[PDB]
Design a protein around this ligand. Structure first.
Ligand SMILES: Nc1nc2c(ncn2[C@@H]2O[C@H](COP(=O)(O)OP(=O)(O)OP(=O)(O)O)[C@@H](O)[C@H]2O)c(=O)[nH]1
Ligand SMILES: [Cl-]
Ligand SMILES: [Cl-]
Ligand SMILES: [Cl-]
Ligand SMILES: [Cl-]
Ligand SMILES: [Mg+2]
Ligand SMILES: [Mg+2]
Lengths: 1016, 209, 123
């Protein structure tokens, strides 16, 4: 189109054509906007587009054209500035400075093109970052002088100082070398008194102008770093705390200024500075009460209405009070004349904590935690805040949010459904409220109980019954478990549950019953101490959980099984013994009616039920009773199991029935569930099924392969094959579960592993990729982890079966087979730690693929893969060095030392792997340290390339100097020399070594970096 | 109808394009195709105060693909800053995105969004996220995959852009749809694709729905 | 909303996909409640499905007598069919849809209601 013309630099640039491309891009739409987009991108990245920028700024009619012209300059200044001749350097400075002055002197331009002024100022500051003070010593004096001659210029100079402070103190850590940031910080520090005085004068001689706001905005930045004397030993605190609080458009920035003030570096042994810290607080609270709102005001509603800036202001007020009071409240708690100030400030926070906005509430709750922890440990303080804490309990109790245990939830329509997702943010909010509430109960357990019982009273008689109110109250009652005495707890709990049982029988409909059931279950689950001492109530609880397992509403039954587990892991002892006045241990009554009570549960609920039963049974430590309790629990699963394997091993084609495959899977899932809670104790049941289970694995394997061969790869997606692969994954998971928790490791080696490896390794290696289960890798990881030291040859066999063929699946992109990818490097990690000898038994060609496999893991951005990849590399280097001066280690270094050095350099420096920076550095440092401690006993170089007497230190720095020179051709030789020098001297100090590396990452993004930076 | 320019910024891979595409078409793109510069997308929501349109400027997070960078922010009326709760580094550069953003847009509503909260191994946990408190950003955990809180950024911006705190999304009315006849000249084209559709498996077959 | 002159014959939670024929992949269109609405004036039955939270329409078409529910190779709780005129997204379009449910029971229940609705639209 006509718009492509601006990318042809053969001609003069048509400014009108540019402005239209720009206009099309910003104000147009559709494919013209999209065509314009790519044209300006090509225009902007053209390496000589900066030469036009002078031209555009003069004659363009379009602000955003000029913005883009500056962006092009910006990228010139920040990256290739130092190669320009100085004719162009000073010229660019001159027309950037002149454009700023020219725009400030025209008042309608100053009013209307704020974006373009702001971008020019940022571009000036990028010029300052490379030229000032060494090639511009006059800048700050001239800036100060120019301020007095024009007010628009004065205001704009505050924006330039603000941005300069930001770039030097707030964002320099990542973007400059240590030595340059140190140089620019010292330069500002020496010139700040000239700057502070100009800022102080502006603030005294002016009220609420836009010049005032711009100055306060720059002061906020200076407060991050300036010496305390500029704030405490001038009058600036009084101005901030009174004059700039009354005017509403300086008020927001002042309040952020005083928040940063409530964080300075300040002596603690000076009572005048303490007086000033009190006074600016007293002045600010004074100005809020008379100019903004009184202590009594309903901030909940103010915040809800969202008039003007009320939301931002209430946020900034919350941040001010909690910052100031977390550090200085003790300055208020002794003097009786400041008691009113102290409590008025907290009263404002009480009103802030009523605002219905979660992030604001998290801000105040963190402060309340800070306060009530202090009142609980600090002597003689809690009485000061008695009334504050009493209202704080009400706030927390009425705004409890749902704990993780509660699975029923109100939706948008207003019915009670089971929760779809885990809400991790609200789970965390619940624990934060619990921790504050727990402290507040300890500070006055009578008040807390009174609030709660009288709230419960008003739920029974209905005068404020609601789903919200019964929930929040129930959750608060549950969260304070352990704060009461055993006697007060017993009266409290008996009351609360008897009443909650009352509500459940009273109310109509399955929604009201689902709500009250989830509340009952939350409470009971939180008080096992009470349940353990009162078998009467424990057993009614358990039986009541069994009733809830029969409810239509699936959310209620799920929570019953989880509450049953929660009670049983704390009360299991009381189920396993026979109580007074009963026939049997309750476990055998539970196992007895296990089919009836689980009748309307879905499969995974019943599997949870059996896991709870498993938790109980493992409390019994006599082997004979536990082995048979186990046998009785597994009777339904074993009964069904025996009929299935007698059918299948008789006729191997009866299994294809899809309802048989679900029967088989739920049988195995029941075993997995039970083995999860019993661990080592599971072993008798496992043996009862182990050999038949491995035969059903081989049988199911053949059918998977037969169906892929008959129907194609798509067969892996069908329900029938997915169901049979479920059977293999559940079999592997049961065995992985037992082996991870097993005590008797010789039984593992002598009985379990050889049948396992024969059943699964060949079947994995010889299936097509889309048929191999990543779960096999996972299962082998646990086998090597627990018993690897006892089975060297089995680890060899594992390597050979899975290693090359799985490497072939995952080594052509970073995407395919994502769970194979993760289980594979997990498996190589554990083999390399616990059975490194296995890698020694690999042929040289397979050891090369191993090394290839590691460096492949570095380049991932799936952090499960790369942390294991970098870990394996570090562990392999450790393994080679323990061997010492032997042929395999010396060969390894000659074949792989420089492959490892360059591969970690590549990922350190390519800006695509910055999350592994720390482990990359550690690996690189360990590699460099080997050479500098002479731990490599043969020459790394091939012979007749360097003289024979030369050390590996000498050749390493040539190798790296050459490798860096070609990869980073724009670095000078001195830059590379000084870097490697510093890098090798620092190769035992990880933190400095890492700073050298980050300094290098800065310099490769620019031209002309100073080599002396590496002596920092 | 009135429309507002929205800029969506954040590190590469955090899910900005996935989040936009989930709102445009309903889909969940699993692949990562880094965007180059910006791509502009109209997106309209129906409220009890009429329809609100966002021209969503979906910017590139990778530096090599950055395009015009802060040039995309000019005359933005609102913004979303995106990071990934499974990647600490993307929370570490949130102050860098916010820096570049507010130097160009001095006073606009801005949402901070930590995406991917559906992944079990969360690395930036909900206690560590506090950057929004002093910058007056609204913060939300979201998951473009599970759609957790996926409408709240837009509903918050709509409330502040219109200036009505009680603004709610409402059911757009559904016109009575037609009765069109099939034709045998274009059918054998559709019936090959109907066949291919039956033999192409549905994604995520172990999901609850 | 345009649903008060309409009876709801059947509602079920479901996830709906469209087949992108150039990419060769299924793509989600919406998750939410799928409703069979029967207009009280015409006795015509449409599918109307809205996304959760945004309430946006992701499916809006007559349950035409011609349509056939066919299984999808990878799923037992899904149906596939070619729709000739859907208006969820502006002007009418053709689509190959897939709709998947939480359960094999719901899928088979949908199938029977779906063809009950086809009988109604004939008459
Ligand atoms: N598990 C999970 N994955 C997600 C989620 N959101 C996005 N992803 C994936 O993360 C990747 C993000 O890709 P994009 O959405 O293109 O990322 P982007 O932020 O647009 O990247 P740039 O365009 O480079 O800036 C894609 O693979 C998504 O499938 C999520 O909520 N959960
Ligand atoms: Cl502009
Ligand atoms: Cl001073
Ligand atoms: Cl116990
Ligand atoms: Cl040099
Ligand atoms: Mg993108
Ligand atoms: Mg019609």
């Amino acid at each position: 189109g006509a718009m492509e013309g601006i990318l042809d630099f053969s001609n003069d640039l048509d400014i009108a054509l540019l402005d239209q491309v720009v206009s099309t891009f910003y104000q147009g739409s559709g494919v013209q906007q999209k065509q314009a987009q790519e044209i300006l991108t090509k225009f902007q990245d053209n390496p000589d587009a900066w030469q036009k920028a002078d031209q555009i700024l003069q004659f363009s009619t379009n602000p955003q054209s000029k913005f883009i012209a500056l962006s092009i300059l910006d990228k010139l200044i920040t990256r290739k500035w130092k190669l320009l001749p100085n004719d162009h350097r000073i010229g660019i400075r001159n027309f950037v400075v002149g454009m700023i002055i020219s725009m400030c002197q025209d008042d309608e331009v100053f009013k209307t093109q704020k974006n373009l002024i702001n971008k020019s100022d940022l571009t000036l500051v990028q010029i300052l970052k490379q030229e000032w003070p060494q090639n511009w010593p006059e800048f700050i004096p001239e800036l100060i002088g120019s301020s007095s001659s024009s007010v628009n210029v004065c205001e704009n100079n505050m924006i330039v100082l603000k941005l300069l402070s930001e770039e030097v103190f707030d964002f320099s850590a990542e973007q400059m070398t240590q030595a340059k940031a140190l140089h620019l910080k010292n330069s500002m520090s020496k010139e700040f008194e000239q700057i502070f005085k100009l800022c102080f004068q502006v603030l005294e001689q002016g009220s609420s102008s836009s010049l005032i706001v711009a100055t306060l905005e720059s002061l906020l930045r200076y407060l991050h770093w300036i010496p305390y004397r500029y704030i405490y030993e001038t009058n600036i605190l009084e101005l901030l705390s009174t004059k700039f609080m009354t005017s509403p458009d300086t008020r927001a920035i002042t309040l952020k200024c005083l928040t940063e003030v409530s964080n300075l570096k300040i002596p603690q042994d000076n009572d005048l500075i303490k007086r000033q810290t009190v006074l600016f607080f007293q002045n600010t609270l004074q100005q809020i009460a008379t100019s903004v709102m009184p202590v009594t005001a309903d901030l909940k509603a103010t915040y809800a209405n969202a008039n003007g800036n009320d939301q931002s202001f209430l946020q900034d007020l919350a941040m001010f009070l909690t910052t100031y009071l977390a550090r200085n409240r003790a300055l208020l708690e002794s003097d009786e004349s400041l008691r009113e100030l102290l409590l008025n400030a907290h009263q404002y926070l009480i009103q802030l904590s009523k605002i219905e906005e979660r992030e604001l509430f998290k801000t105040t709750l963190d402060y309340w935690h800070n306060l009530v922890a202090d009142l609980f440990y600090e002597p003689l303080k809690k009485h000061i805040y008695e009334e504050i804490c009493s209202q704080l309990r009400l706030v927390i109790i009425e705004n409890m949010v749902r704990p993780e245990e509660v699975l029923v939830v109100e939706n948008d329509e207003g019915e009670i459904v089971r929760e779809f997702v885990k809400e991790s943010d609200t789970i965390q909010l619940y624990k934060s409220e619990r921790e504050v509430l727990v402290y507040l109960t300890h500070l006055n357990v009578i008040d807390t109980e009174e609030i709660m019982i009288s709230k419960l009273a008003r739920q029974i008689d209905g005068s404020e019954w609601s789903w919200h109110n019964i929930n929040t109250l129930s959750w608060a009652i549950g969260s304070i478990s352990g704060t009461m005495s055993e006697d007060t707890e017993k009266r409290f709990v008996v009351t609360v549950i008897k009443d909650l049982l009352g509500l459940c029988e009273q109310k109509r409909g399955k929604d009201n019953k689902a709500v009250v059931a989830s509340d009952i279950m939350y409470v009971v689950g939180q008080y096992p101490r009470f349940l353990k001492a009162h078998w009467n109530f424990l057993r009614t609880v358990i039986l009541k959980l069994f009733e809830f397992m029969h409810e239509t509403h699936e959310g209620v039954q799920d929570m019953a099984c989880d509450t049953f587990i929660k009670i049983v892991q704390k009360c299991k002892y009381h189920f396993v013994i026979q109580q007074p006045r009963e026939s049997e241990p309750f476990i055998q009554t539970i196992i007895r009616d296990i089919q009836k009570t689980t009748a309307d549960l879905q499969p995974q609920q019943v599997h949870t039920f059996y896991k709870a039963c498993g938790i109980i049974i493992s409390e019994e430590r006599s082997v004979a009773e536990r082995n048979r309790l186990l046998s009785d629990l597994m009777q339904l699963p074993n009964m069904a199991w025996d009929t299935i394997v007698e059918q299948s091993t008789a006729n191997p084609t009866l299994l294809l029935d899809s309802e048989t495959v679900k029967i088989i899977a739920n049988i195995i899932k029941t075993n997995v569930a039970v083995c999860t809670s019993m661990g080592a104790d599971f072993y008798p049941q496992l043996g009862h099924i182990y050999y038949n289970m491995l035969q059903l694995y081989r049988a199911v394997s053949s059918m998977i392969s037969a169906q892929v061969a008959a129907e194609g790869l798509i067969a892996t997606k069908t329900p029938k094959v997915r169901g049979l692969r479920t059977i293999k994954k559940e079999i592997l998971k049961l065995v992985e579960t037992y082996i991870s928790k097993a005590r008797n490791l010789d039984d593992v080696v002598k009985v379990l592993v050889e049948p396992l490896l024969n059943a699964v390794l060949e079947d994995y290696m010889n299936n097509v990729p889309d048929a191999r289960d990543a779960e096999v890798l996972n299962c082998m990881t646990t086998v090597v982890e627990k018993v690897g030291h006892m089975i060297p040859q089995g680890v060899i066999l594992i390597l050979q079966s899975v290693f090359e063929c799985t490497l072939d699946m995952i080594n052509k992109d970073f995407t395919e087979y994502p769970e194979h990818r993760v289980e594979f490097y997990k498996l190589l990690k554990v083999i390399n730690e616990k059975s490194f000898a296995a890698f020694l038994e690999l042929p040289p060609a397979a050891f090369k693929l191993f090394v290839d496999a590691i460096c492949w893991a570095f380049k991932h951005n799936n952090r499960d893969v790369e942390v294991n990849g970098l870990q394996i590399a570090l562990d392999l280097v450790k393994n080679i060095e323990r061997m010492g001066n032997v042929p395999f280690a010396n060969e390894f270094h000659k074949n792989y030392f420089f492959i490892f050095v360059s591969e970690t350099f590549f990922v350190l420096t390519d800006s695509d792997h910055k999350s592994g920076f720390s482990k990359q550095a550690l690996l690189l440092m360990k590699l460099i340290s080997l050479v500098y401690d002479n731990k490599i006993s043969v020459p790394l170089y091939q012979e007749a390339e360097v003289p024979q007497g030369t050390s590996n230190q000498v050749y390493l720095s040539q190798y790296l100097a050459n490798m860096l020179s070609n990869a980073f051709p724009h670095l000078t030789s001195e830059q590379i020399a000084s870097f490697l020098s510093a890098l090798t001297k620092q190769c035992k100090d990880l933190v400095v070594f890492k700073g050298t590396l980050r300094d290098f990452l800065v310099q490769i993004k620019e031209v002309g970096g100073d080599p002396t930076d590496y002596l920092f | 109808q009135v429309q507002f320019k929205l800029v969506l910024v954040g590190d590469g891979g955090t899910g900005k394009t996935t989040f936009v595409k989930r709102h445009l078409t309903g889909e969940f793109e699993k692949k990562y195709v880094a965007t180059l510069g910006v791509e502009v997308h109209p997106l309209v929501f129906h409220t009890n105060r009429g329809p609100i349109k966002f021209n969503v400027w979906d910017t590139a997070g990778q530096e090599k693909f950055g395009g015009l960078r802060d040039g995309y922010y000019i005359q933005a009326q609102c913004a979303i800053i995106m990071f990934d709760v499974t990647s600490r580094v993307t929370y570490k550069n949130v102050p860098n995105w916010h820096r570049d953003l507010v130097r160009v847009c001095e006073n606009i509503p801005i949402v901070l969004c930590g995406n991917k909260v559906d992944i079990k191994d969360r690395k930036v946990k909900a206690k560590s996220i506090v950057f929004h408190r002093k910058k007056n950003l609204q913060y939300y955990d979201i998951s473009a995959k599970s759609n957790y809180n996926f409408e709240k950024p837009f509903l918050w911006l709509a409330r502040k852009l219109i200036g009505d705190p009680n603004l709610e999304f409402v059911a757009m009315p559904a016109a009575a749809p037609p009765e069109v006849v099939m034709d045998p000249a274009l059918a054998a084209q559709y019936e090959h694709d109907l066949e291919v559709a039956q033999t192409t498996a549905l994604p995520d077959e172990d999901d609850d729905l | 909303t345009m649903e008060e002159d309409e009876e709801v014959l059947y509602k079920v939670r479901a996830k709906l996909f469209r087949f992108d024929a150039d990419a060769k992949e299924w793509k989600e269109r919406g998750t939410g409640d799928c409703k069979f609405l029967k207009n009280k004036k015409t006795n015509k039955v449409r599918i109307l499905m809205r996304r959760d939270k945004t309430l946006k329409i992701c499916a809006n078409h007559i349950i035409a007598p011609e349509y056939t529910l066919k299984p999808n190779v990878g799923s037992d709780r899904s149906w596939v069919y070619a729709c000739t005129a859907d208006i969820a997204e502006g002007e009418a379009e053709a689509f190959t849809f897939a709709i998947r449910f939480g359960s094999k029971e719901n899928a088979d229940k949908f199938k029977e209601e779906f063809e009950k609705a086809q009988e109604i639209n004939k008459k």
